[PDB]
Design a protein around this ligand. Structure first.
Ligand SMILES: Nc1ccn([C@@H]2O[C@H](CO)[C@@H](O)[C@H]2O)c(=O)n1
Ligand SMILES: Nc1ccn([C@@H]2O[C@H](CO)[C@@H](O)[C@H]2O)c(=O)n1
Ligand SMILES: Nc1ccn([C@@H]2O[C@H](CO)[C@@H](O)[C@H]2O)c(=O)n1
Ligand SMILES: O=Cc1csc(-c2cccnc2)n1
Ligand SMILES: Oc1ccc(-n2ccnc2)cc1
Ligand SMILES: [Cl-]
Ligand SMILES: [K+]
Ligand SMILES: [Zn+2]
Ligand SMILES: [Zn+2]
Ligand SMILES: [Zn+2]
Lengths: 151, 159, 159
């Protein structure tokens, strides 16, 4: 039937003085992401991918509240435009800290916010092999892909 | 149904003495994108996503500087030709999504015009075309305003 | 039908004294990619996109660098095992698209061979596999030839 794809990108600076929150999970680290609220780079990328699949513009056009509430509101808008979410996949690029321990928590948060079965939500983690601002630990990036169907 | 997905990436340097053209829209700005044609980074990324989804290779394999048909061609003519070759391969386009990463200028006022241009070029309804924008939070070459990147995703179906 | 999409990213440093192996192809070059495995940036990205489409985590979850077999590992053997697990999870692969970003060497002469390797490893026909190449238009650590990046997208369907 009427499938659509969306894609998302986000990046925030990594500096001392803020908590590190990614996919709704507070992760221990000497530094944190700089941004408007929680600065949750993963949730922002996913939100963008969903708005994009629905052809509803982008996160800034809707939301001029933490990133989970934003994600839930995004999902309601996608629903009203006539779309059902089929799956989400994503990558976090961070040289440090280790994210693997926290992946299931992020997945659970995202699945809850999107009203999706856990097996339709995935989060992957990558380093930048010490290259660039990412590899020097100066920022963290997230990428997201979402598939939806008009129902 | 025989669905396929494609993904595209492009980046160009921002240089003095050239117009800034993104998604077919000329945007007032002191610098423009450097490339063999208008260097429309967004249209190029979408073009690569469509060639990718149809397993037709990539933009540099289709469009040569050398080829008389495409020498003086702008990126919208190339996007139209891409759509032609996708159709020739037996595919129909279902939707396009994309992100422009530019620290500056402000792209918001231009995005609906970009969508309209892409939709016309691809013979798609407006509600199957999407364009998003992001800054790079002052990080790296994008954050320093040295270039602008575009990312695209395309879904097609073999009919 | 129960379609799912996945995406993948990888990057490795380019260093002297290593084979340059991308898409399973040994490319003549004075430098190669640095990793604990054979460091095949394209196959790793594709592997992550396939695990991601199946919601099976990521390549590090599946192939531990603590396994003696990881050192110098043939990333095509890893991709085939990835495909095996994706199948075991109940998914059939519908298509793959990808981009390699490298200042050098020229990848064009090797791309069809990469596509054939990926197609063989995933038991797909050639017409469902695509590999695209880009330079980074001289920007950043990729423009300086310090590393090579790969991006991938995969579509699967749960049978
Ligand atoms: N160069 C840029 C970058 C971003 N934007 C818009 O700002 C909002 C927050 O990213 C988003 O709504 C985005 O569209 C913009 O107008 N120009
Ligand atoms: N390192 C690279 C980068 C790009 N290319 C090929 O050049 C054309 C323009 O990106 C594209 O056709 C691309 O495939 C290449 O052969 N080697
Ligand atoms: N910041 C990061 C980066 C990566 N990873 C995990 O380590 C594996 C190899 O990079 C990756 O495949 C991923 O499993 C992690 O846990 N935290
Ligand atoms: O999942 C186990 C594992 C870790 S490395 C590995 C492997 C390495 C080389 C060839 N075939 C397999 N297998
Ligand atoms: O267990 C691992 C470790 C590193 C890996 N990797 C880093 C960059 N590319 C693959 C993959 C799997
Ligand atoms: Cl490796
Ligand atoms: K990037
Ligand atoms: Zn953000
Ligand atoms: Zn271009
Ligand atoms: Zn790798």
């Amino acid at each position: 039937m009427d499938f659509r794809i969306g894609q998302g990108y986000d990046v925030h600076q990594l500096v001392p003085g803020r908590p590190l929150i990614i996919g709704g999970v507070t992760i221990p680290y000497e530094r944190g992401l700089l941004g408007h609220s929680d600065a949750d780079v993963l949730l922002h990328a996913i939100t963008d991918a969903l708005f994009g699949a629905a052809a509803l513009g982008d996160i800034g056009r809707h939301f001029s509240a933490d990133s989970r509430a934003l994600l839930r509101e995004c999902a309601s808008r996608v629903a009203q435009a006539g779309f059902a979410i089929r799956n989400v996949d994503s990558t976090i690029i961070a040289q440090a800290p280790k994210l693997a321990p926290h992946i299931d928590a992020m997945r659970a948060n995202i699945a809850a916010d999107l009203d999706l079965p856990l097996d339709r939500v995935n989060v992957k983690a990558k380093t930048n092999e010490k290259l660039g601002y990412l590899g020097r630990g100066e920022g963290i990036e997230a990428q997201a892909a979402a598939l939806v169907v008009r129902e």
